[PDB]
Each structure stands twice: as structure tokens, then as C-alpha cells.
RNA sequence: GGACUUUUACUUUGAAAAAAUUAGAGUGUUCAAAGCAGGCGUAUUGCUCGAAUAUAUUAGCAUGGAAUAAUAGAAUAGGACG
RNA sequence: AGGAUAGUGGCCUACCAUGGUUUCAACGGGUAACGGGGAAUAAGGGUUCGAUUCCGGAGAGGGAGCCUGAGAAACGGCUACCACAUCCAAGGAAGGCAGCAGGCGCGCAAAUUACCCAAUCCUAAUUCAGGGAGGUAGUGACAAUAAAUAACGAUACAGGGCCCAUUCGGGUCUUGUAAUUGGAAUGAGUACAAUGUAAAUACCUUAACGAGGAACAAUUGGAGGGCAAGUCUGGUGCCAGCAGCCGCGGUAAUUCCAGCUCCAAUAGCGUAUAUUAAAGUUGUUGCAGUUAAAAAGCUCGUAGUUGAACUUUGGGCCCGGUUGGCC
């Protein structure tokens, strides 16, 4: 329509934000950023509909403007900034550090963690290229573009970063038999320990993946997210660890935790 | 009855953070008087059709309406 | 633009209107359970028909069909929680068989009459709508309740109305003022 | 045999054969043609205003003998001439002439109901005044 | 057709009718009260059970 | 990677198919239509499950099969192994 | 080959070959056609609708053009023409509600020329301002949810078991029948108020006030059938009129018009029109074709649909999973 969009209704906003179909017929549009539109969590929906630390966007703007908040080691004083996958946020108040990861129910969880677990993150390499003047570089899944990494670091690998700079703490390559995390599809939030893969040269590299209950499935190689090696995750993981039990098994779980 | 309660760290904190309607219904402030929203829009359209300060147009309208 | 509020009925009219058998049976039911509306009767029959369709198209399925297991167990759970069904009949065939009479006896008005706070189901109706009642610690003025049996244990008259004290009555105060004036 | 083919790659034959036979069908025809909108007087509308011109004393079809006290009408959006059954007793005296009345159909979808030949329509109002109300004196007509 | 005719006779019997008016009676029960009356008329009231349960017995 | 990979239809499985809607889990809007909230405290620090799941036509990608239907194959062999 | 484009490319030009689509329905016409996500409706299959809250498109009175700009072919921006239409101190000047309200006209058919940015969001240089986007309230019987209009004790009749079987006495208790009578019993509406909300007005709360029916008064259809509900009274006399279909009425009307009674549904009920089921009366599932409508006068024949059988069976050998089956 004659130019960029600026508005966003509810019911075009994604499902997993869990925004309610009442309460005004307009929704918070994620302004552009280092993450996409849909696999992103605005800070407004975060603060206003995950913690209830505020009730209204006016209050949230007060918060963002008084700068209790900071992402990537930076204040990021916008009410609708994309808090994407894996991302880190640090709050002086309560001295908390929340991390933005997924749950198996297909939602952005709220992973309470410490300042060092915030001070490092994870990032999937999106691609690698050679910039001008012969500077090899790569770019991640969070719009971060980084220069002079190891040549051993290639595509589909994952990096662990300092968060005071965009430099590397370490890296993990992609190969058969490594612990991963899923981003896309019915498997949103699974953790399923690569068992093998398949090429289909021409499009849609596919991967057969199963979690420790033997339970297997198949996913796209650009929807997966490698988090390190089998056993140790490089971070702390949320309730469930990407399992997707049955409706009845979860019913029994909660009925035990009545 | 059931509602929402909110205590602040102090009166000044409440005054700065809370809504003006809430403070004035508590009695902590004065509801600033305004005219009709339509009247605000009316004078806005007026001074949108006007350009500049206005003293020159005033003197010109004076010299013209003199006769 | 505001997404429109869903609405959907809770009843269904008779396919064929004038069947004397149908009319007399449902009149018996209305005149015993203290009802005003074939609307209400159709409504309850419609709920029953929905659950019965579910029962049919579930027992169509094999055993250990996890859909059958989950949904049938939840159906059992709500039926025992509401009390139309027993605490020992979970085999789904009793569910095929259950009755509008069962729903009606689990309603509040005739329950009130069985408990004896009415002397007539119609007396229960007028007491309900005049708020001389509360099933828990909050007043209710709806006959159609489908009690959950915790209410049954917790029944009493309205605390904030006579027959549970706390006030003599509107016309009670009226009569008292009348006799005060007479003595005056 | 049976006529209708049965092969697995003859759906074209099936669709076109059925298309022709649906043209032989009734409502498909008028629906796809828009008779209600292009040739019918109303334009497929449920009701229609109209102007009476005169009165008519149509005799009744057999086996019956009466006069049905109908009237002659012209419409406004179209200008086509229509008859309308003043239904009940005295209503003609109620709706004498020049009235900007409202008309509707009978209930047989383009046909006459009883012993009222040539007629598909009846009267329902008089300048915004319903005839049953006039007939039972719950209301009374604007004089002019 | 005889499209014209005796259009003068309209309103004959409705005008000629001898006007009689509705006698008075108390306002009757409404809703469930009326249906209560109907149940207790039809079943516990055995007023007309001769062979086939008429409802408006003409004076017989 | 070199390589012959004669053609299909079919059929199985999976990824994916925007929400709302629909069916449907849980949920006492006082019931209900609804909505997605709620519930529990030592009620001062507070604790806490949720917002499932299913459906998603043809067509498109991969996909195990090789029955069924056709489908060219080396015959006055420019025939394969050589 | 070149030009243009932000970019490929008949997008355009120069030159050249003369091709390209077609019954596997091209092309042309029509469309009360924007499309889809979806809605009604059903055993299945399905048929119909879908402008219409979400997605993508198109448009700003019809057309054309273009500046600015990252982004428009912008129209709540410019230029012209066309049809509209306004103010003129007649020289000239300014516009395009298919934005919110609102008006005329069109009609069968459709709301206030209101309050607020409190929220949902957006925008700017920016927390602070603006926003008929939006929310709020008003009209609102479009559709949906709940559910009042009345009830309860005793007093005159009629019962059903049981006891006495001492007769037809009681009837203990019945459950109704009632120009019986009494209470308590709150609601609708009034609220003082608080609460509600930006401020409110409404809901809930509860004071104070607010029923015995004359009270505070439930209508809409119908009573011959399908189709439940008068062998009731008066009037009418194939007239007036009723009735979807059948039919009623021509001096005893079970249909008409009134009174009474009665049934259906109920703050809704009917009526008219469209559409689905019904409808195996569109028939793929699943129609008919001797006579009920329908087998071409007969034959050939292209596309089309359909098209004889055969080419790997067999057995052994092991393996390990599901189901029961000892324990």
C-alpha cells in the first residue's frame, strides 16, 4: 500500500506473543531491528504481559526512559524493540538477568539467570563472506556482523560472545551428534540431539533429530539452532528442556503439582 | 469488593509516576481547565490558515478596515 | 476492526413441531420441575445431544486411542464433578443413556425443594429470584446452575436476607411500622 | 453401461453433462440468468412501494363465487403496473386512492394463492400505516 | 375476467356485525405459573379423560 | 566425487501450510453466551499451572514401495558385454 | 544489436525468420464477480453464500500527467480536460465525505452534526504534544446469553393408601378443587451514597422509598385436516370474507365477522423474498429413457472415454519387534 507499513492490528500479530483479541483493536508493531517481525518479542509485551511490572505503555515508556533496562549491554530505550531468540536483558532493579529463549509450548519463555550467563550469549551464524579490503567476516541470526573469526568457523556453526564486544568467547561447529535447539514449526522449543541429516542438494537441507526419550522427528536445517555438544548445554535451560509430553502426561504433571 | 492497590515508595514518587486523573481524584492536584476539543481544533485551523506572528496582518487589517 | 465477540446459542428447536407425545412429556417435566420455557427444555436436550454425539463418535474408536482416553476421561470428570453421573459409572454407556431428568434433578431449584427450603419447586424459584439463598458465600439468583456438589455441601439460605437472618424483611419492617403506628 | 461414463479421466464430460442438465433444472436457470433482477418487476426485492391508480372487482376462480376487491398499482423505481389484493374486509375503503402503499408477495413465489387469478402480490401498508392495524383500529390513517 | 363488479358491498358483515365486547376477568398466571396450571389441569385434574382427552368440551 | 542414473500416474511418511474462526483441554464472567483468565499463601518477604492439542484440500519439495495402468527398449542388429 | 529501467525482458526501437493459441473450448460476450481466510447446512458425498472486523488487491467524481521525496502516479498534493458545484464590492478566487458526525436524493432496506485520548497503538526533534485511527456514551427488538410478570400457610369440597373393619364414623397424612383468609417476599422503578469510569451515565452493593392483583394488568398465531387446539353462543347467507395445499360460505357455517373457551411459542410471534436440508426432484456416491418426458431415421467417423492374457512364482535359512500366552 504505497509504502512501508506502520500499524499492526491484533490477529495479524503472531500467536506466540499470546496477545489478547480484546483490549483495543491495534497491536504493537515491532519496529525494525536485528531480528525478524514474528520470531521477536517486543519489550512492551514483555514487561506488560510477562511480568506485569507495568500495566500500560505509558508506564513502560517511563521505565525505558529512566533506563533501568539494557539489551546487548546497551539501554535500548524503545518500547517495541525486538527481543529476539536467545537474547539477553539485564535489570539493575532486582539485579536480575532475563534471557529470551523458547518453550516447548511455542512461546517466548522468561529464563531468570545471573549476570555472567547474561554476559555471554549464543548466536547462530547466518552466513560468511569476504568484506572489502580482504576482511573476512560473518553475520549471525541477530544482525551482528563480525570480522576476523577463525576460518574453521563456517556456516551453520554457533558462537558464544562476550556481550561487551561482538567478539568471540568460543565457537562450536555443525556436525552429526551435537546438541541443538529448535526454532520453527511444531517443534518450537525442542532439544533433540542431532542423529543424522540429509542434503537434497538444491534446497531444504533436512535433519533427523531426537531427544533423549528416543523420540525423533525431522526439521529444517535453518530452523534448528546448535547450542554446543551433547550433554553440556552452553547455557541453562527452561522447564521441560524441549520434551513435548502428551496432553495426558502434562495433565498428570500438573495434577501432581496441584 | 476486589480491586487493585498500589503503594509507592513515597508521595513524590506517586505524584511523578501515577496518572493525572488518579492524582486529582485523590485530591493531590488540580484538573487543568480546557475548552472543547472542537474549539482547540478550531483555533488550530485558524492559526493554521494564519502565517507568522500576526502584528503585520493586524496593522494591515486596521489600515484596510479604516474605510 | 475490533474483533467481533463470538456468540453461539445453547439450544435447538424441535425438528417437527406438533407431536402430542413430545409436548405432553415435556409438559410433565416442566410442571414437575417448575419451568416456564420449552426454550429451557430444548436447551438441555441440545446439551445432552451434543455430549451424546461425542459419546457415539468416541466409542466408535478403538480402545487405547489417546484421543478417546483423554476426552472420555475428561467427560467422565466433568459429569462426576457436576453429579448428573455417579461416582462408579465411567464406562461411557451410562453416558449414552443419561437423562434430561438427571440434568433436571441436578438443577438448583428442585435440589432446593428436595433439601426442603421451598415447600414447592415454584417456591424455590421465587426464593432464588428474590435472593433468599446462597449456595456458597455469595448470593445467586439463577435456577439453572448445574451444581458441582461442593455447593451442595455448602448450601444455606441467604446470609444477607431473612431465612438466614441479618434482616427481618421489607414487609417485615412494614408490618412492624404498621403495628407501631397502631400502638401509637 | 447405464449411460453416465465411469472412467477415471472423464470428469470433463461429467461436469459439462451436469451443467446442461442443470440448465434443464429450474432454479439454477433463473439464478444464473437473473430473471428476478432483469425481467421481474420487483427486482428480486421482498417488498416495494407503489401508487394505486384505480380499483378492481376481480371475480373468483372456481369452485367459488366472490369478488376479491383488489386494486391496480404502479411502482416507482420501475414504473411497471401491478395488481394487489386488498386482503380483508373494509380495507378498500381504508385505502381508497392515491396512497403511496407498500406491497409484497403472497407466499407462492410468483404465483396466485387461491381464487385470485393474475395476482402474485398484496398490500401491507398505507403510507407507512399497516392494514391490520387499520382493520382492528389499533391505529388510524394519516388523512392526507 | 369480470375485473369490475360489486365493490360496493365491501365491509358488509364487519359493519353489520353486532358489537360485543370482552368481559372482565383477573389477570392470569404468566410463564411457569401458567404451565403449572396446565400440568395440574391436564394430569392431576381428571376433568376430561373420557376416552381420548378432549380439551375444549363443547356443552354436551 | 567418475559413473549408468528410459518415463509417468499411484501410494506411504515427514517439513510447511498467518491468525481469528471451527472441534476441543483447563478455566466458577454469580450460571450461561463469553473471555483467557486464574488458583494458593505464613496474606509482611510472597508461592504458582496456564493460554494445550487436533484439522489444514488439490498443487509444490523430499519421501519407502513396487501390485495396478500404460511407457521406448537389440531384428535389410549402426547390438552389450571386450 | 542498442536504448530505457533501480533491475531481467518486445519494456521500446532498428533489422531479420514467420511464426504463436486453439474442441484437453483459444478468442469474444455476460456477471445483481474483487479474490482468499471463512459462513449457513448436512450421515457421508455435497449445494449455496462469502462487499462486509483478518490477509492481499483497486480506487478517491472519470481520465491523463508529474513534482517532492527512500517510498506516491499521492488526490484530506499539484497541472489540464470532462461533468458537478460555490463566493463575487463581475475584475477574479477556491473545491473535490467511497474519513467521523450530519444532510439531500435512492429506495423495501439502515444510528448522534456527542465526550475523551483514560486505555490499544501510531507519529514527531520527542517520556511531556497530536490523533473522529481508536475507546467512550446515545439511537438500536439485526442477531446471541441469563431471566421477572408470581408464589407460601391455614379455612368450604373430592380423593389413596392404613388402621380400627365397632355400621356410611374417624379419617389420621394425602393432593388438588375454592367470590376464602392471612402473612412474610423481594424485584422493576426510585440511591442518599459509595463504586464505576478521563469526568461521567449505566451494571453490582446497600440504606430510605418501593405488591395481593384494579395490582406493577404478555403478547403473537390458530382451533376441519397435514397440524394440537370448540360438534360452544350470536351474526352472515357462494354476498362479505377465510385459506401456503385441500377446501369453507348459496339461511342450523366445527374455517367467514364478533363473544366465550381451548392449544402452540413466549418478550417475543408472524409475514414477504433469497438459500440449504427435505430432494435418490442434479443422482460421482446415486436418477429416468417399451408404454408415464425422454434411444438421434440408419450407417460411417475425428478428437474424446474405454481397451484380451503373459515377462518373479517359489521355497529354504536365520534375525530381531507387537500381541497375547507359563511364571
UniProtKB/Swiss-Prot annotation, chain A:
Main location: cytoplasm
GO biological process: cytoplasmic translation; translation
Chain ranges of the S4 RNA-binding domain: 41-104
Covalent cross-link Glycyl lysine isopeptide (Lys-Gly) (interchain with G-Cter in ubiquitin) as placed by the record, residue numbers: 61, 133, 160, 167, 173, 178, 210, 232
GO molecular function, one term: rRNA binding
One cellular component (GO) term of this entry: cytosol
The protein's role, per its UniProt record: Component of the ribosome, a large ribonucleoprotein complex responsible for the synthesis of proteins in the cell. The small ribosomal subunit (SSU) binds messenger RNAs (mRNAs) and translates the encoded message by selecting cognate aminoacyl-transfer RNA (tRNA) molecules. The large subunit (LSU) contains the ribosomal catalytic site termed the peptidyl transferase center (PTC), which catalyzes the formation of peptide bonds, thereby polymerizing the amino acids delivered by tRNAs into a polypeptide chain.
Signal peptide span: none
Subcellular location: Cytoplasm
Coiled coil found in the keyword field: no
Keywords: Cytoplasm, Isopeptide bond, Phosphoprotein, Ribonucleoprotein, Ribosomal protein, RNA-binding, rRNA-binding, Ubl conjugation
Phosphoserine found at: 31, 246
Family (UniProt): Belongs to the eukaryotic ribosomal protein eS4 family.
UniProt subunit comment: Component of the small ribosomal subunit (SSU). Mature yeast ribosomes consist of a small (40S) and a large (60S) subunit. The 40S small subunit contains 1 molecule of ribosomal RNA (18S rRNA) and 33 different proteins (encoded by 57 genes). The large 60S subunit contains 3 rRNA molecules (25S, 5.8S and 5S rRNA) and 46 different proteins (encoded by 81 genes).
Protein name as catalogued: Small ribosomal subunit protein eS4A
Positions carrying Phosphothreonine: 114
Curated annotation (Swiss-Prot), chain B:
Transmembrane segments: none
Domain of life: Eukaryota
Compositionally biased tracts (Basic residues): 37-47, 56-67
PTM characteristics: N-terminally acetylated by acetyltransferase NatA. Also partially acetylated by NatC.
Localisation: Cytoplasm
Coiled coil residues, start to end: none
Region described as Disordered: spans on this chain: 34-67
Miscellaneous notes: There are 2 genes for eS24 in yeast.
Family of this protein: Belongs to the eukaryotic ribosomal protein eS24 family.
Subunit structure: Component of the small ribosomal subunit (SSU). Mature yeast ribosomes consist of a small (40S) and a large (60S) subunit. The 40S small subunit contains 1 molecule of ribosomal RNA (18S rRNA) and 33 different proteins (encoded by 57 genes). The large 60S subunit contains 3 rRNA molecules (25S, 5.8S and 5S rRNA) and 46 different proteins (encoded by 81 genes).
Function: Component of the ribosome, a large ribonucleoprotein complex responsible for the synthesis of proteins in the cell. The small ribosomal subunit (SSU) binds messenger RNAs (mRNAs) and translates the encoded message by selecting cognate aminoacyl-transfer RNA (tRNA) molecules. The large subunit (LSU) contains the ribosomal catalytic site termed the peptidyl transferase center (PTC), which catalyzes the formation of peptide bonds, thereby polymerizing the amino acids delivered by tRNAs into a polypeptide chain.
Protein name: Small ribosomal subunit protein eS24A
Positions spanned in the full protein: 69 to 135 of 135
Curated annotation (Swiss-Prot), chain C:
Superkingdom of this protein's organism: Eukaryota
Classification via Pfam families: Ribosomal_S4, S4
Cellular component terms per the entry's GO annotation: 90S preribosome; cytoplasm; cytosol; cytosolic small ribosomal subunit; nucleolus; nucleoplasm; small-subunit processome
Example GO biological process: translation
Domain S4 RNA-binding positions: 106-180
GO molecular function per UniProt: rRNA binding; structural constituent of ribosome
Localization terms from the record: Cytoplasm; Nucleus, Nucleolus
InterPro entries: Ribosomal_uS4, Ribosomal_uS4_CS, Ribosomal_uS4_euk/arc, Ribosomal_uS4_N, S4_RNA-bd, S4_RNA-bd_sf
Disordered: region residues: 159-184
Swiss-Prot/TrEMBL keywords: Cytoplasm, Isopeptide bond, Nucleus, Phosphoprotein, Ribonucleoprotein, Ribosomal protein, Ribosome biogenesis, RNA-binding, rRNA processing, rRNA-binding, Ubl conjugation
Presence of keyword Nucleus: yes
Keyword field contains Oxidoreductase: no
Record cross-link Glycyl lysine isopeptide (Lys-Gly) (interchain with G-Cter in ubiquitin), residues: 179
Modification Phosphoserine, positions: 183
Family, as annotated: Belongs to the universal ribosomal protein uS4 family.
Subunit and partners: Component of the small ribosomal subunit (SSU). Mature yeast ribosomes consist of a small (40S) and a large (60S) subunit. The 40S small subunit contains 1 molecule of ribosomal RNA (18S rRNA) and 33 different proteins (encoded by 57 genes). The large 60S subunit contains 3 rRNA molecules (25S, 5.8S and 5S rRNA) and 46 different proteins (encoded by 81 genes). Interacts with snoRNA U3. uS11 interacts with MPP10. Component of the ribosomal small subunit (SSU) processome composed of at least 40 protein subunits and snoRNA U3.
PANTHER family named in the record: 30S 40S RIBOSOMAL PROTEIN, 40S RIBOSOMAL PROTEIN S9
Protein name: Small ribosomal subunit protein uS4A
Annotated gene: RPS9A
UniProtKB/Swiss-Prot annotation, chain E:
Gene Ontology CC: cytoplasmic stress granule; cytosol; cytosolic small ribosomal subunit
Location of this chain's protein in the cell: Cytoplasm
Entries under InterPro entries matching the protein: Ribosomal_eS30 (IPR006846)
Sections of the chain in a coiled coil: none
Keyword Ribosomal protein belongs to the record: yes
Alphabetical keyword list: Cytoplasm, Phosphoprotein, Ribonucleoprotein, Ribosomal protein
Residue numbers of Phosphothreonine PTMs: 47
Region listing for Disordered, in residue ranges: 1-34
GO biological process: cytoplasmic translation
This protein's record includes keyword Cell membrane: no
Record-level Gene Ontology MF annotations: structural constituent of ribosome
Modified residues (Phosphoserine): 15
Pfam family, one: Ribosomal_S30
Note: Present with 37600 molecules/cell in log phase SD medium. There are 2 genes for eS30 in yeast.
Function noted in UniProt: Component of the ribosome, a large ribonucleoprotein complex responsible for the synthesis of proteins in the cell. The small ribosomal subunit (SSU) binds messenger RNAs (mRNAs) and translates the encoded message by selecting cognate aminoacyl-transfer RNA (tRNA) molecules. The large subunit (LSU) contains the ribosomal catalytic site termed the peptidyl transferase center (PTC), which catalyzes the formation of peptide bonds, thereby polymerizing the amino acids delivered by tRNAs into a polypeptide chain.
PANTHER family: 40S RIBOSOMAL PROTEIN S30/UBIQUITIN-LIKE PROTEIN FUBI, RIBOSOMAL PROTEIN S30, ISOFORM A
The family this protein is said to belong to: Belongs to the eukaryotic ribosomal protein eS30 family.
Protein name (database record): Small ribosomal subunit protein eS30A
Source species taxonomy: Eukaryota, Fungi, Dikarya, Ascomycota, Saccharomycotina
Amino acid at each position: 500500500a504505497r509504502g512501508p507499513k506502520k500499524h499492526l492490528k491484533r490477529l495479524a500479530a503472531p500467536h506466540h506473543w499470546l496477545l489478547d483479541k480484546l483490549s483495543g483493536c491495534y497491536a504493537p508493531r515491532p519496529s525494525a531491528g536485528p531480528h525478524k517481525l514474528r520470531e521477536s518479542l517486543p519489550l512492551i509485551v514483555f514487561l506488560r504481559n510477562r511480568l506485569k511490572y507495568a500495566l500500560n505503555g505509558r508506564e513502560v515508556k517511563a521505565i525505558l526512559m529512566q533506563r533501568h533496562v539494557k539489551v546487548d549491554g546497551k539501554v535500548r530505550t524503545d518500547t517495541t524493540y525486538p527481543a529476539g531468540f536467545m537474547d539477553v536483558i539485564t535489570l539493575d532493579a532486582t539485579n536480575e538477568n532475563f534471557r529470551l529463549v523458547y518453550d516447548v509450548k511455542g512461546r517466548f519463555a522468561v529464563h531468570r539467570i545471573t549476570d555472567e550467563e547474561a554476559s555471554y550469549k549464543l548466536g547462530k551464524v547466518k552466513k560468511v563472506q569476504l568484506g572489502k579490503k580482504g576482511v573476512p567476516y560473518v553475520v549471525t541470526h541477530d544482525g551482528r556482523t563480525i570480522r576476523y573469526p577463525d576460518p574453521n568457523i563456517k556456516v551453520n556453526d554457533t558462537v558464544k560472545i562476550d556481550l561487551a564486544s561482538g567478539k568471540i568467547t568460543d565457537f562450536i561447529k555443525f556436525d552429526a551428534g551435537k546438541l541443538v535447539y529448535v526454532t520453527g514449526g511444531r517443534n518450537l522449543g525442542r532439544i533433540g540431539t542431532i542423529v543424522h541429516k540429509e542434503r537434497h542438494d538444491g534446497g531444504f537441507d533436512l535433519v533427523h533429530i531426537k531427544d533423549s526419550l528416543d523420540n525423533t522427528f525431522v526439521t529444517r536445517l535453518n530452523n534448528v539452532f546448535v547450542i554446543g555438544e551433547q550433554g553440556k548445554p552452553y547455557i541453562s535451560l527452561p522447564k521441560g528442556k524441549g520434551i513435548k509430553l502428551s496432553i495426558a502426561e502434562e495433565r498428570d504433571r500438573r495434577r501432581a503439582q496441584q | 469488593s476486589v480491586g487493585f492497590g498500589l503503594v509507592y515508595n513515597s508521595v513524590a514518587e506517586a505524584k511523578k509516576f501515577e496518572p493525572t486523573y488518579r492524582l486529582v481524584r485523590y485530591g493531590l492536584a488540580e484538573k487543568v481547565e480546557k475548552a472543547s476539543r472542537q474549539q482547540r481544533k478550531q483555533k488550530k485551523n485558524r492559526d493554521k490558515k494564519i502565517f507568522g506572528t500576526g502584528k503585520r496582518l493586524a496593522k494591515k487589517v486596521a489600515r484596510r478596515n479604516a474605510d | 476492526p475490533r474483533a467481533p465477540r463470538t456468540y453461539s446459542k445453547t439450544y435447538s428447536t424441535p425438528k417437527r413441531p406438533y407431536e402430542s407425545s413430545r409436548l405432553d412429556a415435556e409438559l410433565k417435566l416442566a410442571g414437575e420441575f417448575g419451568l416456564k420455557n420449552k426454550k429451557e427444555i430444548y436447551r438441555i436436550s441440545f446439551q445432552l445431544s451434543k455430549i451424546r454425539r461425542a459419546a457415539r463418535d468416541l466409542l466408535t474408536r478403538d480402545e487405547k486411542d489417546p484421543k478417546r482416553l483423554f476426552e472420555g476421561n475428561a467427560l467422565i470428570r466433568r459429569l462426576v464433578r457436576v453429579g448428573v453421573l455417579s461416582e462408579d459409572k465411567k464406562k461411557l454407556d451410562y453416558v449414552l443413556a443419561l437423562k434430561v431428568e438427571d440434568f433436571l434433578e441436578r438443577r438448583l431449584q428442585t435440589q432446593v425443594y428436595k433439601l426442603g427450603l421451598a415447600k414447592s419447586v415454584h417456591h424455590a424459584r421465587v426464593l432464588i429470584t428474590q435472593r433468599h439463598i446462597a449456595v456458597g458465600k455469595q448470593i445467586v439468583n439463577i435456577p439453572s446452575f448445574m451444581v458441582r456438589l461442593d455447593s451442595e455441601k455448602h448450601i444455606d439460605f441467604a446470609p444477607t436476607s431473612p431465612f438466614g437472618g441479618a434482616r427481618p424483611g421489607r414487609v417485615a419492617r412494614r408490618n412492624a411500622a404498621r403495628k407501631a403506628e397502631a400502638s401509637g | 453401461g447405464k449411460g453416465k461414463p465411469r472412467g477415471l479421466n472423464s470428469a470433463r464430460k461429467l461436469r459439462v453433462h451436469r451443467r446442461n442438465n442443470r440448465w434443464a433444472e429450474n432454479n439454477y436457470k433463473k439464478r444464473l440468468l437473473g430473471t428476478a433482477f432483469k425481467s421481474s418487476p420487483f427486482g428480486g426485492s421482498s417488498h416495494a412501494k407503489g401508487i394505486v391508480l384505480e380499483k378492481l372487482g376481480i371475480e373468483s376462480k372456481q369452485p367459488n363465487s366472490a369478488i376479491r376487491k383488489c386494486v391496480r398499482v404502479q411502482l416507482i423505481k420501475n414504473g411497471k403496473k401491478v395488481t394487489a389484493f386488498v386482503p380483508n374486509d373494509g380495507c378498500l375503503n381504508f385505502v381508497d386512492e392515491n396512497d403511496e402503499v407498500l406491497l409484497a408477495g403472497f407466499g407462492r413465489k410468483g404465483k396466485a394463492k387461491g381464487d385470485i387469478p393474475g395476482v402474485r402480490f398484496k398490500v401491507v401498508k398505507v403510507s407507512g400505516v399497516s392494514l391490520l392495524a387499520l382493520w382492528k383500529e389499533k391505529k388510524e390513517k394519516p388523512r392526507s | 375476467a369480470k375485473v369490475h363488479g360489486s365493490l360496493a358491498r365491501a365491509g358488509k358483515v364487519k359493519s353489520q356485525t353486532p358489537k360485543v365486547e370482552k368481559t372482565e376477568k383477573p389477570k392470569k398466571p404468566k410463564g411457569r405459573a401458567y404451565k403449572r396450571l396446565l400440568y395440574t389441569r391436564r394430569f392431576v385434574n381428571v376433568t376430561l379423560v373420557n376416552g381420548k382427552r378432549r380439551m375444549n368440551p363443547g356443552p354436551s
